[PDB]
Design a binder for this molecule. Structure first.
Ligand SMILES: CC(=O)N[C@H]1[C@H](O[C@H]2[C@@H](O)[C@@H](CO)O[C@H](O[C@@H]3[C@H](O)[C@@H](O)[C@H](O[C@H]4[C@H](O)[C@@H](O)[C@H](O)O[C@@H]4CO)O[C@@H]3CO)[C@@H]2O)O[C@H](CO)[C@H](O)[C@@H]1O[C@@H]1O[C@H](CO)[C@H](O)[C@H](O[C@]2(C(=O)O)C[C@H](O)[C@@H](NC(C)=O)[C@H]([C@H](O)[C@H](O)CO)O2)[C@H]1O
Lengths: 213, 212
């Protein structure tokens, strides 16, 4: 179990800098390189750079010298620093370990970085109430920033028939999404349906009970 | 840089069917690598050194090629192979990735089940009315949703969002959200969403009247 994990700030203002830490385990940074990759939302993978076990570095010239990678072996940490972020630096950032064929054998979970001067805002949560053998209900999660929010149903116990839509960025600069679940008509009197909405950037948790009108 | 070209960018295959995706390097490389990525979670190493399977990759995958010309093949397409596959070269700097091939499972036609939701009273107190139309578990992806308010076609005030192909059943789901001011929401009676899809003999219309 080689593991890597990114920690980073989430929101960064334009022209300010980005720092992310990659904390590793199951391997020694003195013997192995660590690469960095990003993915702009809805787009492809792009390589950023590498620090090798000896501490030597290589960077993508498309970053025009804005990127430095460093590491501290005893702390099991690799540091990425990217200066002067602009809007097009918005991406999910991954650290990765080259392995077989010098391809990226192990990846962190990624950390979303949003480049924006706009401020954090928690969502409003509204019920999508079942109509008058299958019925649908849901929650509308409106007017938050930045991504992401998570939505679970009944604390994660209800998973079958759930569809949580991709968030859309509105004109306002805020995001919205709906989460729905189809359930048996016969459960509507009986069963409790709670959408649990968590928006970590604002420290907002909302549990919204959804019942017939 | 050594640009890698993956075309076509999107393809579909029915279950059991053989599928081949190509990757072309502008300059010759000694080895090509490949990654699989499902729904914007971390990519996974899939094939390294042209033809070697990474761990956990089932034997139905293979890779081949040489020089500028590489491919990845799935002997028999399965529902779990729905993903984006990226080629990648690490033979010369900068390290480069292909643009991706997104592979869809071509299943049987399935008609959406359609649901309409009026705005919550709680939302209305705030001054806005979102009305939601839900298309659940349909195939193929192409579907037309129109909003009609007392018979008038709306435009410019709705947004659609679509799920990825479902893991198990290979269907889509789609929400369409009409946003109105409360004042305007109260100026009209009949709210209808109208759904056109090849699984339906004729369009489905689901409507309500504000009031109950
Ligand atoms: C040696 C070298 O030139 N490394 C380059 C690397 O070149 C590769 C690469 O371009 C690939 C294609 O992606 O093509 C060649 O390699 C071929 C295969 O892909 C590869 O699988 C195959 O490996 C053989 C292996 O050689 C045999 O000995 C083994 O028994 O079998 C395997 C399986 O066949 O070999 C093929 C060719 O014969 C190229 O050789 O390219 C990357 C860029 O993607 C870098 O440029 C590599 O060079 C690194 O340079 C930095 C300096 O800038 C460092 O020198 C680094 O060395 C260290 C390090 O400091 O990180 C030294 C450590 O001792 C070493 N650790 C261990 C435990 O060995 C690490 C470690 O190897 C790396 O961090 C990767 O995890 O490297 C150079 O590697």
């Amino acid at each position: 179990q080689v593991q890597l994990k990114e920690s980073g700030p989430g929101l960064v203002a334009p022209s300010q800098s980005l720092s992310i830490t990659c904390t590793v385990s199951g391997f020694s940074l003195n013997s192995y390189g660590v690469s960095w990759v990003r993915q702009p939302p809805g787009k492809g993978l792009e390589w950023l750079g590498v620090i090798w076990g000896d501490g030597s570095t290589n960077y993508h010239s498309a970053l025009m010298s804005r990127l430095r990678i460093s590491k501290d072996n005893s702390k099991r940490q690799v540091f990425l620093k990217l200066n002067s972020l602009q809007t097009d630096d918005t991406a999910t950032y991954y650290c990765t370990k080259p392995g077989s064929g010098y391809a990226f054998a192990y990846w962190g979970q990624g950390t979303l970085v949003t480049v924006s001067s706009a401020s954090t805002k928690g969502p409003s949560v509204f019920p999508l109430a079942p109509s008058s053998g299958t019925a649908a209900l849901g929650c509308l999660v409106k007017d938050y920033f930045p991504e992401p929010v998570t939505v679970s149903w009944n604390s994660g116990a209800l998973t079958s028939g759930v569809h949580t839509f991709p968030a859309v960025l509105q004109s306002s600069g805020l995001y919205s999404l709906s989460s729905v679940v189809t359930v048996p008509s016969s459960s509507l009197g009986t069963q409790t349906y709670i959408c649990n909405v968590n928006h970590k950037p604002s420290n907002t948790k909302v549990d919204k009970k959804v019942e017939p009108a | 840089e050594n640009v890698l070209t993956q075309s076509p960018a999107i393809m579909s295959a029915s279950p059991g069917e053989k599928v081949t995706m190509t990757c072309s390097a502008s300059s010759s490389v000694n080895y090509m690598h490949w990654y699989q990525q499902k729904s914007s979670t971390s990519p996974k190493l899939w094939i390294y050194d042209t033809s070697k399977l990474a761990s956990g990759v089932p034997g139905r995958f293979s890779g081949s090629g040489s020089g500028n010309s590489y491919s990845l093949t799935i002997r028999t397409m399965e529902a779990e192979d729905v993903a984006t596959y990226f080629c990648f070269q690490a033979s010369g700097y900068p390290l480069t990735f292909g643009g991706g091939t997104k592979l869809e499972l071509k299943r049987t036609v399935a008609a959406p089940s359609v649901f309409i939701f009026p705005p919550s009273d709680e939302q209305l107190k705030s001054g806005t009315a979102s009305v939601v139309c839900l298309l659940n578990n349909f195939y193929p992806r192409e579907a037309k949703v129109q909003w009609k308010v007392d018979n008038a076609l709306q435009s410019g005030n709705s947004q659609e969002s679509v799920t990825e192909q479902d893991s198990k059943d290979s269907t889509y789901s789609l929400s369409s959200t009409l946003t109105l001011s409360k004042a305007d929401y109260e100026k009209h009676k009949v709210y209808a969403c109208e759904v056109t899809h090849q699984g339906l003999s004729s369009p489905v219309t689901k409507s309500f009247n504000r009031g109950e």
